[PDB]
Amino acid sequence: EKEHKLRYNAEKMFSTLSKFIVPETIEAVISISQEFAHNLEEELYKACLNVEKIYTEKVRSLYSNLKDKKNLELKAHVVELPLNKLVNMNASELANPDLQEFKEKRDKIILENFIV
Amino acid sequence: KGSRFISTLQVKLYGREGSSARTIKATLPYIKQDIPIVIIFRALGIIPDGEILEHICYDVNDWQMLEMLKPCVEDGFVIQDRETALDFIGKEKRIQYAKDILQKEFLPHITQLEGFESRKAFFLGYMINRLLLCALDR
Amino acid sequence: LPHFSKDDYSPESKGFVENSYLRGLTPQEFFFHAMGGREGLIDTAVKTAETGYIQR
Amino acid sequence: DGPTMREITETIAEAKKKVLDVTKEAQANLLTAKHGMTLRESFEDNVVRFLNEARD
Amino acid sequence: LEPGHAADQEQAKLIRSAIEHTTLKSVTIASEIYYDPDPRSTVIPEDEEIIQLHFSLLDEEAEQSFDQQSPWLLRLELDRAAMNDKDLTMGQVGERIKQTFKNDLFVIWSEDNDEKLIIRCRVVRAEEDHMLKKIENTMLENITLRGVENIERVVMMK
Amino acid sequence: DQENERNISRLWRAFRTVKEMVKDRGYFITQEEVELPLEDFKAKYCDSMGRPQRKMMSFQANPTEESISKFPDMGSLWVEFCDEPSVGVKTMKTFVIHIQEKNFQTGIFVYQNNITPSAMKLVPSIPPATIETFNEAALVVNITHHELVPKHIRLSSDEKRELLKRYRLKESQLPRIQRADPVALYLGLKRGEVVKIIRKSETSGRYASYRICM
Amino acid sequence: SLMSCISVGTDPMPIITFLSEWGMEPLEDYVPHQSPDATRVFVNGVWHGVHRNPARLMETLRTLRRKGDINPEVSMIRDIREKELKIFTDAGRVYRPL
Amino acid sequence: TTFRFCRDCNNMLYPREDKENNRLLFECRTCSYVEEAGSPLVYRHELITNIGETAGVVQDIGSDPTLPRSDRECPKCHSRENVFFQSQQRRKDTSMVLFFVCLSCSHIFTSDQKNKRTQ
DNA sequence: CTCAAGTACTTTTTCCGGTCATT
RNA sequence: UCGACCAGGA
DNA sequence: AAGTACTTGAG
Numbered sequence: 001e002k003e004h005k006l007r008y009n010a011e012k013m014f015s016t017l018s019k020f021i022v023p024e025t026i027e028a029v030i031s032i033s034q035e036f037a038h039n040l041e042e043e044l045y046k047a048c049l050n051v052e053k054i055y056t057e058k059v060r061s062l063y064s065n066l067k068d069k070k071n072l073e074l075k076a077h078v079v080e081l082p083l084n085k086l087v088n089m090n091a092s093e094l095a096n097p098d099l100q101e102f103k104e105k106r107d108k109i110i111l112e113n114f115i116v
Numbered sequence: 117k118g119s120r121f122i123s124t125l126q127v128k129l130y131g132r133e134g135s136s137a138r139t140i141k142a143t144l145p146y147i148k149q150d151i152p153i154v155i156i157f158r159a160l161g162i163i164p165d166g167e168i169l170e171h172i173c174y175d176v177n178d179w180q181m182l183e184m185l186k187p188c189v190e191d192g193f194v195i196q197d198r199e200t201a202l203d204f205i206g207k208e209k210r211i212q213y214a215k216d217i218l219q220k221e222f223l224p225h226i227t228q229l230e231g232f233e234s235r236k237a238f239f240l241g242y243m244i245n246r247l248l249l250c251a252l253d254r
Numbered sequence: 255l256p257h258f259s260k261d262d263y264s265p266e267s268k269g270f271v272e273n274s275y276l277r278g279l280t281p282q283e284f285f286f287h288a289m290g291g292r293e294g295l296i297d298t299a300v301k302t303a304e305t306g307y308i309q310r
Numbered sequence: 311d312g313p314t315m316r317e318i319t320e321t322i323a324e325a326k327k328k329v330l331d332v333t334k335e336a337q338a339n340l341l342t343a344k345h346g347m348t349l350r351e352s353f354e355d356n357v358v359r360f361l362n363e364a365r366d
Numbered sequence: 367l368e369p370g371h372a373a374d375q376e377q378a379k380l381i382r383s384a385i386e387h388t389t390l391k392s393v394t395i396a397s398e399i400y401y402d403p404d405p406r407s408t409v410i411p412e413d414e415e416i417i418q419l420h421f422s423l424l425d426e427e428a429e430q431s432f433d434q435q436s437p438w439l440l441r442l443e444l445d446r447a448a449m450n451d452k453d454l455t456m457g458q459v460g461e462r463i464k465q466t467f468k469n470d471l472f473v474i475w476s477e478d479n480d481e482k483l484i485i486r487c488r489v490v491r492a493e494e495d496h497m498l499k500k501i502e503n504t505m506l507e508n509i510t511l512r513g514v515e516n517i518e519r520v521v522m523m524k
Numbered sequence: 525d526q527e528n529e530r531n532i533s534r535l536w537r538a539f540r541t542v543k544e545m546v547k548d549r550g551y552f553i554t555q556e557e558v559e560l561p562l563e564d565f566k567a568k569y570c571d572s573m574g575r576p577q578r579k580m581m582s583f584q585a586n587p588t589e590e591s592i593s594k595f596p597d598m599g600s601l602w603v604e605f606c607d608e609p610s611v612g613v614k615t616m617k618t619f620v621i622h623i624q625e626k627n628f629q630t631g632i633f634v635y636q637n638n639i640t641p642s643a644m645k646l647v648p649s650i651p652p653a654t655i656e657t658f659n660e661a662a663l664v665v666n667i668t669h670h671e672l673v674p675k676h677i678r679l680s681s682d683e684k685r686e687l688l689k690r691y692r693l694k695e696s697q698l699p700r701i702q703r704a705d706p707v708a709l710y711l712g713l714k715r716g717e718v719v720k721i722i723r724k725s726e727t728s729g730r731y732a733s734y735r736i737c738m
Numbered sequence: 739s740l741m742s743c744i745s746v747g748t749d750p751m752p753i754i755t756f757l758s759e760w761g762m763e764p765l766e767d768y769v770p771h772q773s774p775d776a777t778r779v780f781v782n783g784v785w786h787g788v789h790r791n792p793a794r795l796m797e798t799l800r801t802l803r804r805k806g807d808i809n810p811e812v813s814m815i816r817d818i819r820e821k822e823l824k825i826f827t828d829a830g831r832v833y834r835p836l
Numbered sequence: 837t838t839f840r841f842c843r844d845c846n847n848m849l850y851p852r853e854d855k856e857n858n859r860l861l862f863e864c865r866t867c868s869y870v871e872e873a874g875s876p877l878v879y880r881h882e883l884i885t886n887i888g889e890t891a892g893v894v895q896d897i898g899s900d901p902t903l904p905r906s907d908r909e910c911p912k913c914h915s916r917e918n919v920f921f922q923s924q925q926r927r928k929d930t931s932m933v934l935f936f937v938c939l940s941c942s943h944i945f946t947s948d949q950k951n952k953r954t955q
Numbered sequence: 956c957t958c959a960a961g962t963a964c965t966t967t968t969t970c971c972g973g974t975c976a977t978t
Numbered sequence: 979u980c981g982a983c984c985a986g987g988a
Numbered sequence: 989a990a991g992t993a994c995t996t997g998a999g
């Protein structure tokens with residue numbers, strides 16, 4: 001009932017993520033960014049409030065990690081990688097390929113510590 | 117040589133690591149309670165909190181130590197005068213009594229004479245500096 | 255000991271006796287062994303009453 | 311035995327060189343501590359270990 | 367471990383994390399009190415991108431409750447390694463504080479991706495200065511992020 | 525879905541243990557009834573939204589044919605569960621008067637978080653009958669199933685009488701089990717009841733002790 | 739030990755008077771923020787004042803004791819990492835020759 | 837943090853909020869003095885510390901005989917003259933990194949092969 | 956009128972010549 | 979002919 | 989030193 005009002009604002013972010021869409025041409029417009037906003041916004045409604053909270057921050061991690069560049073520019077071009085799986089992903093995977101180097105370093109070196 | 121004074125001064129840091137507002141008090145011979153250091157400094161002569169700060173911290177590029185002194189400054193703030201500090205050693209009777217203790221029983225090495233109030237104040241500050249020094253784990 | 259420079263974590267510094275009893279001990283080795291040996295006499299003395307009271 | 315003695319002496323030497331390695335490496339901030347221990351605590355275990363392996 | 371998981375090292379890692387008691391204190395670098403008089407706009411240019419993805423989306427009644435709030439802001443930086451090693455997400459952390467203080471404290475936070483991990487707090491509704499210092503004490507020493515109370519440094523064994 | 529299901533698992537885990545407790549106490553419940561699965565559990569006591577209704581869970585169990593031979597005076601028990609985390613003095617009387625009219629000999633009340641000190645001081649109000657309070661979280665795990673917990677067995681007035689005769693014992697001379705004891709609570713042990721504890725020995729193979737209640 | 743002795747106890751005023759006449763700023767006139775590096779001088783755990791260049795003062799006393807003018811038993815230490823200079827005329831200190 | 841004092845009576849400065857112009861002021865409680873706050877930061881905690889490691893690096897550091905000397909050449913003057921201490925931070929948790937001070941340029945450089953330090 | 960902290964109390968292995976004062 | 983200290987033994 | 993077994997005292 002009041003959720004629909006909030007759903008409107010959700011799409012508006014992936015609409016500027018138009019301002020993210022620029023370096024896709026600069027290596028390897030405002031119309032398809034509106035279409036691709038609805039490509040994820042309704043796919044997140046699928047992931048949420050199922051059968052019968054979560055959602056709000058899910059959109060943030062997508063915007064924040066996709067905003068990135070010039071490290072996630074490689075992961076952002078493979079996107080235009082499917083736009084169906086990306087929804088159920090979230091956190092540590094959406095990270096930079098340069099950051100998932102230190103994330104591997106920390107986790108794989110602490111495994112030799114807590115294994116006494 | 118001079119009876120061989122059994123008097124030991126304790127300068128304590130009240131509160132633990134993770135306890136809000138840690139205060140510094142000191143036990144002075146022949147006065148039951150452990151009075152905040154700022155009052156002692158004022159009772160010795162050093163009245164503005166920042167001259168009292170200058171007696172403890174020998175560098176004003178050391179905020180870590182100074183931040184630890186902030187609550188102690190607040191504690192002492194109730195008393196603003198030397199006579200009001202000597203009184204906070206329990207009138208006229210409790211003021212002379214105080215005057216005498218700081219001369220005779222507070223830090224009786226150095227001097228027990230009179231005007232060396234400054235010498236004892238710098239020493240007090242040295243003790244407080246060495247206290248906060250292990251408190252910071254330096 | 256005052257026969258070492260600071261921040262020395264080497265076997266020799268923190269009491270490693272490279273020598274046999276037949277060979278003989280260096281003065282530093284002798285003193286470190288002396289501290290370790292004293293620990294033995296203390297533990298035998300300290301924990302001997304504690305153990306006794308336990309029986310009683 | 312004489313040659314056995316040289317053999318023992320170089321066993322200490324190879325173990326002291328093994329310590330020095332782990333010491334200068336830990337000084338170069340490369341060491342990784344096994345849980346419930348400081349880099350310092352974890353290092354000290356290795357020292358103690360190489361020197362006790364050695365004696366035995 | 368459960369009989370049908372005895373040798374599954376991965377199952378053990380999950381329990382290890384699920385039982386080892388974690389406090390906000392363990393993942394915090396420093397806490398700071400800032401005088402940011404307007405809630406909508408932040409004096410800190412590092413926190414520019416934070417207010418953006420939180421005020422637009424979290425429009426869920428947050429206007430009248432509140433459009434101030436408290437001018438006094440409590441800001442705390444978290445460690446990536448501390449967050450990663452003791453497996454956590456800014457979202458996870460943020461919601462715990464948000465459910466410890468309920469609706470008496472307005473909590474916002476930087477995303478996991480961000481170069482500086484931050485959590486911004488404001489009171490809800492005279493001498494608020496010391497009144498907020500008490501809130502950080504209950505936040506560092508009295509909050510549980512993960513795990514069981516009294517349980518510390520849990521280790522795996524083959 | 526996230527931490528919604530964790531309350532559900534736990535409620536079913538506790539249900540099974542309550543089932544086991546009543547079964548092991550002497551009442552008629554089947555292993556087929558105990559082993560009731562979670563998906564099936566939900567299907568019976570979960571509301572239209574997947575929120576479990578504890579009022580439904582509440583049930584009665586009657587003594588097995590073998591139980592009536594040992595202890596004939598053993599009457600049927602009523603087990604109630606409350607959907608209110610804090611159990612009031614209003615709800616407690618609705619339970620207490622249920623046993624009083626239906627003339628139940630025993631009654632187990634399974635609470636969520638707490639019961640009013642007002643309400644909890646109504647337990648000895650209905651003799652000869654007795655009431656027993658149990659927290660859900662405590663019943664999640666059947667402590668009797670643990671490695672170190674041997675089989676404790678309730679002795680009949682005659683079984684007991686005989687034991688003391690054969691060992692030439694005064695009641696005092698027997699090793700005691702505390703009334704508050706987790707296993708004594710599991711078996712609704714009453715002051716003076718004796719349990720025969722059968723344990724395994726590295727020396728005899730099997731050794732059995734006895735414990736008088738506190 | 740065979741070589742160890744215990745200090746009999748000397749007089750601190752001939753060293754107190756020596757110090758002030760060799761560059762010791764009295765504590766009664768200390769300006770802590772003006773000279774904040776100043777090494778603090780203690781004679782038998784009594785903070786008398788501070789010294790601007792401890793290095794040269796140290797050798798004055800070291801060579802002064804070695805000459806025989808400062809009593810050989812009187813032990814003096816220079817704590818460079820702490821900016822401190824403690825002197826001991828104290829009776830009870832166990833010393834050894836070197 | 838770096839707090840100031842009230843002039844005229846050198847007493848501690850306490851914060852006060854000017855709710856009208858929405859700005860921070862540092863008021864004095866030992867008189868009538870006030871002054872605008874420079875920084876918006878009022879208080880700082882710092883649980884994880886990096887200050888106390890280069891503790892007591894006086895000019896006479898190179899004169900201490902109790903200190904060890906090494907062959908490590910200087911990054912700026914390039915002298916094979918050293919005096920090094922372990923991280924001076926007296927915490928149990930501390931790492932054993934070396935801090936080399938040159939007997940010429942009197943500048944500090946470490947052995948650390950992980951961090952791009954400038955202190 | 957609950958429960959945190961300060962208050963006080965009671966333990967500390969087994970057997971086996973000299974010197975002092977005073978009984 | 980009384981019991982305290984000190985020093986010792988396995 | 990570590991229990992016990994209480995008073996003493998705050999919310």
Ligand SMILES: Nc1ncnc2c1ncn2[C@@H]1O[C@H](COP(=O)(O)CP(=O)(O)OP(=O)(O)O)[C@@H](O)[C@H]1O
Nearest residue numbers: 294298299300301302303305306968969970987988
């Ligand atoms: N303070 C004490 N209390 C009780 N018994 C003691 C004792 N000191 C020694 N003993 C007795 O003496 C036994 C061992 O002591 P000693 O005989 O002096 C060592 P040892 O057997 O001669 O050579 P070792 O040192 O190679 O063992 C103990 O097991 C104990 O029975």
Ligand SMILES: [Zn+2]
Nearest residue numbers: 842864866867
């Ligand atoms: Zn003023």
Ligand SMILES: [Zn+2]
Nearest residue numbers: 910913938941
């Ligand atoms: Zn150089």
